[PDB]
Structure formats: structure tokens, C-alpha cells
Scaffold this active site. Structure first.
Site, PDB file in Angstrom:
ATOM      1  N   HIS A  41      -9.062   2.894  -5.547  1.00  0.00           N
ATOM      2  CA  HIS A  41      -8.871   2.244  -4.254  1.00  0.00           C
ATOM      3  C   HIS A  41      -9.948   2.666  -3.254  1.00  0.00           C
ATOM      4  O   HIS A  41      -9.962   2.180  -2.130  1.00  0.00           O
ATOM      5  CB  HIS A  41      -7.438   2.406  -3.711  1.00  0.00           C
ATOM      6  CG  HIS A  41      -7.091   3.776  -3.221  1.00  0.00           C
ATOM      7  ND1 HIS A  41      -6.387   4.661  -4.013  1.00  0.00           N
ATOM      8  CD2 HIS A  41      -7.368   4.438  -2.074  1.00  0.00           C
ATOM      9  CE1 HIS A  41      -6.229   5.813  -3.356  1.00  0.00           C
ATOM     10  NE2 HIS A  41      -6.804   5.702  -2.170  1.00  0.00           N
ATOM     11  N   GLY A 143      -7.779  11.415   3.598  1.00  0.00           N
ATOM     12  CA  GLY A 143      -8.971  12.096   3.103  1.00  0.00           C
ATOM     13  C   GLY A 143      -8.737  12.886   1.807  1.00  0.00           C
ATOM     14  O   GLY A 143      -9.691  13.269   1.126  1.00  0.00           O
ATOM     15  N   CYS A 145      -7.149  12.087  -1.065  1.00  0.00           N
ATOM     16  CA  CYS A 145      -7.157  11.323  -2.298  1.00  0.00           C
ATOM     17  C   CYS A 145      -8.333  11.748  -3.174  1.00  0.00           C
ATOM     18  O   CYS A 145      -9.453  11.951  -2.709  1.00  0.00           O
ATOM     19  CB  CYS A 145      -7.215   9.825  -2.047  1.00  0.00           C
ATOM     20  SG  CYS A 145      -5.617   9.158  -1.505  1.00  0.00           S
TER      21      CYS A 145
HETATM   22  C1  LIG Z   1      -5.863   8.396   0.129  1.00  0.00           C
HETATM   23  O1  LIG Z   1      -6.293   7.047  -0.104  1.00  0.00           O
HETATM   24  C2  LIG Z   1      -6.897   9.131   0.948  1.00  0.00           C
HETATM   25  N1  LIG Z   1      -8.048   8.411   1.456  1.00  0.00           N
HETATM   26  O2  LIG Z   1      -6.774  10.282   1.154  1.00  0.00           O
HETATM   27  C3  LIG Z   1      -4.554   8.403   0.900  1.00  0.00           C
HETATM   28  C4  LIG Z   1      -3.821   9.737   1.013  1.00  0.00           C
HETATM   29  C5  LIG Z   1      -2.542   9.594   1.832  1.00  0.00           C
HETATM   30  C6  LIG Z   1      -2.729   9.365   3.322  1.00  0.00           C
HETATM   31  C7  LIG Z   1      -1.547  10.080   3.977  1.00  0.00           C
HETATM   32  N2  LIG Z   1      -1.091  11.009   2.950  1.00  0.00           N
HETATM   33  C8  LIG Z   1      -1.630  10.803   1.764  1.00  0.00           C
HETATM   34  O3  LIG Z   1      -1.409  11.457   0.762  1.00  0.00           O
HETATM   35  N3  LIG Z   1      -3.709   7.402   0.272  1.00  0.00           N
HETATM   36  C9  LIG Z   1      -3.318   6.312   0.907  1.00  0.00           C
HETATM   37  O4  LIG Z   1      -3.500   6.189   2.116  1.00  0.00           O
HETATM   38  C10 LIG Z   1      -2.551   5.268   0.098  1.00  0.00           C
HETATM   39  C11 LIG Z   1      -3.457   4.255  -0.607  1.00  0.00           C
HETATM   40  C12 LIG Z   1      -2.932   3.914  -1.974  1.00  0.00           C
HETATM   41  C13 LIG Z   1      -2.283   2.598  -2.214  1.00  0.00           C
HETATM   42  C14 LIG Z   1      -3.606   2.888  -2.827  1.00  0.00           C
HETATM   43  N4  LIG Z   1      -1.565   4.653   1.003  1.00  0.00           N
HETATM   44  C15 LIG Z   1      -1.890   3.514   1.686  1.00  0.00           C
HETATM   45  C16 LIG Z   1      -1.045   2.966   2.571  1.00  0.00           C
HETATM   46  C17 LIG Z   1       0.181   3.579   2.804  1.00  0.00           C
HETATM   47  C18 LIG Z   1       0.509   4.752   2.118  1.00  0.00           C
HETATM   48  N5  LIG Z   1       1.718   5.440   2.315  1.00  0.00           N
HETATM   49  C19 LIG Z   1       2.638   5.215   3.283  1.00  0.00           C
HETATM   50  O5  LIG Z   1       2.579   4.372   4.133  1.00  0.00           O
HETATM   51  O6  LIG Z   1       3.646   6.075   3.120  1.00  0.00           O
HETATM   52  C20 LIG Z   1       4.958   5.861   3.764  1.00  0.00           C
HETATM   53  C21 LIG Z   1       5.706   7.128   3.431  1.00  0.00           C
HETATM   54  C22 LIG Z   1       4.798   5.696   5.260  1.00  0.00           C
HETATM   55  C23 LIG Z   1       5.631   4.663   3.136  1.00  0.00           C
HETATM   56  C24 LIG Z   1      -0.363   5.325   1.197  1.00  0.00           C
HETATM   57  O7  LIG Z   1      -0.153   6.343   0.544  1.00  0.00           O
END
Ligand SMILES: *[C@](O)(C(N)=O)[C@H](C[C@@H]1CCNC1=O)NC(=O)[C@H](CC1CC1)n1cccc(NC(=O)OC(C)(C)C)c1=O
Ligand SMILES: *[C@](O)(C(N)=O)[C@H](C[C@@H]1CCNC1=O)NC(=O)[C@H](CC1CC1)n1cccc(NC(=O)OC(C)(C)C)c1=O
Ligand SMILES: [Cl-]
Lengths: 306, 306
Positions: A41, A143, A145
């Protein structure tokens, strides 16, 4: 003396972390030999995240769309493929700090260390377990991931986890290093919910053994139990079933302490039925289920890593 | 989100760890530039440890008596001196993996990471606090002496602890890297005991802030206390006094959550007087006091180290 939630030393994994950037998205990659692995992603914009067709998105990308940084040095990408939910970038340089390694898929109740990273740079290390509902209770911000979970055996790093997402109640989901999710989760920005979690009974028992080894004995009772009668009680407090394999696996700890596994089970059964009465075990006011029997042996016997 | 007891990445320290053998005693040393630092009791036998005359024993030692091994490689010892309880072994080779480093003496209430080693090889890493009674609650077996405690800031390793001793109650004592003991402990076999401990109030408040940042907010209340009234209560429960300096230090977390410290203190007062009533905070049924305000800010804002 003492008993701590202990992570593996992280140095061998630190040397493998890089930063992967595709357009405006940055996250972490694992550099082993001449491949960099990361969550697929990395190729999505915020638009695409709701319902990405990843195959389609990747076609439109080129080698030069991927910016890989190892400290100060950009690595040239010379190829790319997708395996399940991970992206593999072939780079022109093999990592000189590549350790002996393998990729494994762990089972629920198994433990592993996480090296939390931001922008390709290690931030911290901690031990957790694959929960029975296939989540982990991590500590991960935006960050993180591409941060990985691992075990060390002698000098061999087994990589078992790569971080992808957060689920409700602040728990976490990710893949093995072949890009298959643990549990029924997908890499999609979409409503997803983990199943109800349970306690890893065999791990609770191993930790009771740790307690005895470290001189906490007050919870030992005069009783024994059958496996059947233990499970009848455990089911009722959302404990996982204890199997004969679990009983057999706790045998070494039983021999070291002279306390038969089913005697320890009778003790646990009482703890579940009556509670702890405000009393602690190894400084904990609840029963701890993120040490495996092997983790206990390791720490109480002083196993070390090359 | 999520919140874990997180150690620093241990790789920079791992590259400094070596094995030091003298006669019958093997333990760990810290190799920085062309000096290896280790506990001076490496030179003793068993009858020596009654009241060892270190200065006299060292005179009788030859450089040749010190077998220093860094992985597969013998380091040749070309000199030796003693500073307080630490031995400095001059060797003919500067450590090529020597990181940027400083030697600091930490204050009680502050935290650091321990890299537990055996035979000069890393075993595990975990986070500790220097307790107010100048012990640490570690996990150390025979062979662990010479293991160090450290903090990392950017690329700089601050070495604060080297392990010498276990005490009754399964807690631990050691020195700074200038070889001065934390607390009134001495490096000989003589009956020794920790004083009464206290809870690090400022650290409990920081952790309550961590909980709120992570959405665990059930213990918040609309009430407020004065600082004096807070201290009247907490002091009854063997908590350190909260000073205005502690209140200032909690400023960032206060501003981040919008909850005034004296607001938060009313939660803490209520949790002390009434317990948790079956609930948990960040998964704990007890009040945690081994996170500093800085640990919370670092983990909750993802600050990084290389
Ligand atoms: C990694 O993509 C990154 N760049 O570090 C993200 C890590 C998360 C951010 C907050 N805590 C983490 O562990 N992952 C995401 O942002 C993922 C992308 C995944 C789908 C491909 N992602 C995206 C959108 C939403 C969410 N989770 C979310 O909204 O969680 C609740 C609990 C509010 C439903 C998500 O994990
Ligand atoms: C190191 O010397 C080492 N070789 O690793 C020892 C580490 C401890 C052993 C088990 N866990 C440890 O942390 N340290 C000692 O053995 C010290 C020697 C130091 C004082 C010069 N030492 C010596 C004698 C006795 C004790 N403590 C002791 O017996 O404590 C109990 C709890 C059994 C009363 C000790 O630590
Ligand atoms: Cl607890």
C-alpha cells in the site's frame, strides 16, 4: 533473579531497515540480500486507499517511482513484483549487513519482538504475542508500516511479521513476509473488526512456572485436576482450551520445579474461580499470557544469541 | 496507537559487548575505543570476596591473566587500571564499531534500557527505572555482571549503568561507568538489603496521560485538587511528593490532552483511595510508575534514533 518481558536484541534487524517512498507515501522496508520488502500500500494515494486495485496501481508504476534510502545512500531499484500484500523491490546493491535469516508464519500464542521504525530508522523494541484472534497488541503510529516482528535462534533471524494496519480498540494487524495476513483482514481502508480475544492458557501456565522459579509460591494448592475439568472452568473465563500437546510442552518446566502440570492447572483453576484477592504474581495483579514455555526456559536459563 | 514498555534499539551497544575471563570468572565487558570496562570483581576467586583488597589483588594480576574475547577474536590486553568499582583494560585494538557515547549518572525516577548479556553475547533487552531506593527491578542470572544500561538520544549512547549485584527480593544493584555504586551498596559478599521503596508519582501521572492519549479515559473526572491536598493523600500511600517542578515537567502532556495536572491528580487520588473496581488502564490492573514524561512523549510521537 527477576523476570521481565524481554525482547530479542535488535541489532541484526536494525541493519536491514530502510525507507521506501512512492510519491507522497513513506514507510519502512526490510533490505535482505538484494531485495527490499515492504507493504504494497506504499503505492496508494489517500483516494486509492478506500478500495485499491493494487495490481492495476502497480502496472502504472515504474522502477524509478520507488525511492529507497538506506541512511544517506539511495538504492537503485532495478525491478519490482508483488507477492500477496507485500512489494518486493530488487535493488542493485546487496545489503552487507544481511544476517542469516528465514521467513516463518507463526501460530497464535507464539511471541516475537517488534522493532518499531519511522522513516527507515529504529525507534524502539518490545515483545508481544500473536493473539488467538490473530491481532497483536502493539505500539504503532503513522509511519510505522513495514516495521517487522522476529525471533532469533542462535544467529538466525526468523522474520514472522510485517506491520500494515490498526483495528478497533487500538490493536494491530499485519502479514508474514510472504505477504499473507494473519487472520481475516485485508489491506483496505474499510470497516473491519477482530473476533473476540481469549487468554493463551498454555502461556499463563508457563508464567505460573516462572513465578515458582522466582520464588512466588502462594497460589500453589493441594489439588490436582483432570484436563477435562480444567477446560470446563477455563472455557467459562474465555481461556483457550488446554490440549494434551500443551500439557506435554510444559513438561520441562514441570520437571525443573517438581510441580506436575495438572497440579499447576488446579492452582490456575482456583485463581480463575476465586481471583487473586488483591495479591500479585511476579509483580502482576493479573495473569500474564505473553510468555511461551520456551520464553520462560530462555530467560530462566540465560540463552544467548550470536 | 497502543502503548508498550519499549526499550531502545540495542545494536549500537551489542557491537561493544565482549567477554572478560580472569581465572575462573567469566563476565561481560564494554569495549569502547581501546578500553574494555568491566566490574572489578572479575579479579576475585571466592575466599577473596569476603573483604577483597582490590588494589592488592590487581597488583598480582598480569595483563596475560585477562582473556578478552570479541566474537571469535582475542583482544590482547596491554594494560589495566581501576576506577572505583570498574576495571579498565587497555587493549591493543580500538573498537571499530565504537558509537558516539557519553557516561552519565542517572537520577532515581529516570529510565534506561538494559542489554542483558552472558559470555559477551546479547541475551535480551528491556526497560528499567532507577528506583528511589537506588535498585533496579531487572532480570539477571549468573554471568550477567558487566551488562550495561543506556539511553540513546539521536546517535549518542548515554551509558548509565553496569550490573554488579543481586539483593534479597530479587532486585539488582550496580554502578555508573565511572564505577560509583548507585545507592549505599558495596562490591563484596556481605549481607546487603534495599531500603524501603516509594512510588514515582510523576511517572504514574505521565502514564495516565499516555492512557488518555490512547483513548482509555474512564478514570477521568470533573474534579480538581490542590497540590497540597494531593500530597496529603498520596504521601499516605508511599508516593513521592509531587513538586511544582514535576507539575512543570508534565506541562507538554497536559497541553497535548487539555487536562490540567491538578485535574489529573484528582483521578489519581480517586484511584488510590478506591482502586480500579475491576477495570484496567492500558491493560494494567496496577498503577505503572516506570514511564517518565519523556518516555510517553517519545513513544506517543514516534521519535527516532540513528
Ligand atoms: C501504515 O500504512 C503506515 N504508513 O504506517 C499505517 C499504520 C497505522 C496508522 C495508525 N496506526 C497504524 O498502525 N497503516 C494504515 O494507515 C492503514 C493502511 C492499510 C489499509 C492498507 N490504515 C488505513 C486507514 C485506516 C486504518 N485504520 C483505522 O482507521 O483504524 C480504526 C481503528 C480507526 C478503524 C489503517 O490502519
Ligand atoms: C555477577 O558477579 C556475575 N558474575 O554475573 C553476579 C550477578 C548476580 C548473580 C545472579 N544474579 C545477579 O545479578 N554478581 C554477584 O554474584 C555478586 C558479586 C558482587 C558483589 C561483588 N554477589 C556476590 C555475592 C552475593 C550476591 N548476592 C546474593 O547472594 O544475593 C541473594 C539474593 C542470594 C542474597 C551477589 O550478587
Ligand atoms: Cl497488572
Amino acid at each position: 533473579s527477576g523476570f521481565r518481558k524481554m525482547a530479542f536484541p535488535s541489532g541484526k534487524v536494525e541493519g536491514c531497515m530502510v525507507q521506501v517512498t512512492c510519491g507522497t507515501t513513506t514507510l519502512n522496508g526490510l533490505w535482505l540480500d538484494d531485495v527490499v520488502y515492504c507493504p504494497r500500500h506504499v503505492i496508494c494515494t489517500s483516494e486509492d486507499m478506500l478500495n485499491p486495485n493494487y495490481e492495476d496501481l502497480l502496472i502504472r508504476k515504474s522502477n524509478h517511482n520507488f525511492l529507497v534510502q538506506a541512511g544517506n545512500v539511495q538504492l537503485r531499484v532495478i525491478g519490482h513484483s508483488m507477492q500477496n500484500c507485500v512489494l518486493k523491490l530488487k535493488v542493485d546493491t546487496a545489503n552487507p549487513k544481511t544476517p542469516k535469516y528465514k521467513f516463518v508464519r507463526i501460530q497464535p500464542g507464539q511471541t516475537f519482538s517488534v522493532l518499531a521504525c519511522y522513516n527507515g530508522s529504529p525507534s524502539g523494541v518490545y515483545q508481544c504475542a500473536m493473539r488467538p484472534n490473530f491481532t497483536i497488541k502493539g505500539s504503532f503510529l503513522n509511519g510505522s508500516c513495514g516495521s517487522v516482528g522476529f525471533n532469533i535462534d542462535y544467529d538466525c533471524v526468523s522474520f514472522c511479521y510485517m506491520h500494515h494496519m490498526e483495528l478497533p480498540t487500538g490493536v494491530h494487524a499485519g502479514t508474514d513476509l510472504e505477504g499473507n495476513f494473519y487472520g481475516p483482514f485485508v489491506d483496505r481502508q474499510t470497516a473491519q473488526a477482530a473476533g473476540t480475544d481469549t487468554t493463551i492458557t498454555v502461556n499463563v501456565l508457563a508464567w505460573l512456572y516462572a513465578a515458582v522459579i522466582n520464588g512466588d509460591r502462594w497460589f500453589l494448592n493441594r489439588f490436582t485436576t483432570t484436563l477435562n475439568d480444567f477446560n470446563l472452568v477455563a472455557m467459562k473465563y474465555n481461556y483457550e482450551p488446554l490440549t494434551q500437546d500443551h500439557v506435554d510442552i510444559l513438561g520441562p518446566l514441570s520437571a525443573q520445579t517438581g510441580i506436575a502440570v495438572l497440579d499447576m492447572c488446579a492452582s490456575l483453576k482456583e485463581l480463575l474461580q476465586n481471583g487473586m484477592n488483591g495479591r500479585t504474581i511476579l509483580g502482576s495483579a493479573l495473569l500474564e499470557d505473553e510468555f511461551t514455555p520456551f520464553d520462560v526456559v530462555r530467560q530462566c536459563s540465560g540463552v544467548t544469541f550470536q
